[PDB]
């Protein structure tokens, strides 16, 4: 997932099972003050939902990755 941040302008999140691509994009758009290109999602085999959120080219996910504070 980290590689996706470094190389694909993608933030990766475990996200509510009950969410949806709209509801996820909105939350990402507001918790992080960033704009969003599209969200893909899948249901991981442990029963959680993971969301690939690609940011628009105005943003660098790696920047905003380590603003949030992981790496």
């Amino acid at each position: 997932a980290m590689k996706k941040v470094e190389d694909g302008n993608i933030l990766v999140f475990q996200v509510s099972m009950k969410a949806n691509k709209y509801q996820i994009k909105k939350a990402v758009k507001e918790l992080y003050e960033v704009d969003v290109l599209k969200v893909n999602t899948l249901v991981r085999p442990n029963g959680t939902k993971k969301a690939y959120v690609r940011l628009t080219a105005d943003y660098d996910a790696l920047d905003i990755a380590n603003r949030i504070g992981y790496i």
Partner: protein, 50 residues
């Protein structure tokens, strides 16, 4: 099955998270009897029956 229902996959996920050895520190608990995960399961030894 591949195209599998959500109910089934859910049950499948739970059934997978239960599939681990006993956490070793339980053995250190006081008055502990549990030596090992006696309810443990394997795809090639016992089917789930859905």
């Amino acid at each position: 099955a591949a195209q599998k229902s959500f109910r089934i996959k859910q049950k499948m996920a739970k059934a997978k998270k239960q599939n681990r050895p006993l956490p070793q520190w339980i053995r250190l608990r006081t008055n502990n009897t549990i030596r090992y995960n006696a309810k443990r399961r394997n795809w090639r030894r016992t089917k789930m029956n859905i």
